[PDB]
Amino acid sequence: QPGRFGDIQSRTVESNDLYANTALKLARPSPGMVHVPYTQTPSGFKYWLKEKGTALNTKAPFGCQIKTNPVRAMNCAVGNIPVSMNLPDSAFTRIVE
The CA distance from 74 to 55, in Å, is 16
Choice between 28 and 94, CB closer to another protein: 28
Q: Name the minimum Å distance from CB 6 to another protein.
A: 11
Sign of the alpha-carbon dihedral angle for 30, 35, 36, 41: negative
Q: Which residues contact 45 (CB under 8 A, 6 or more apart)?
A: 5, 7
Q: Name the minimum Å distance from CB 83 to another protein.
A: 25
Choice between 51 and 89, CB closer to another protein: 51
Q: Name the minimum Å distance from CB 15 to another protein.
A: 12
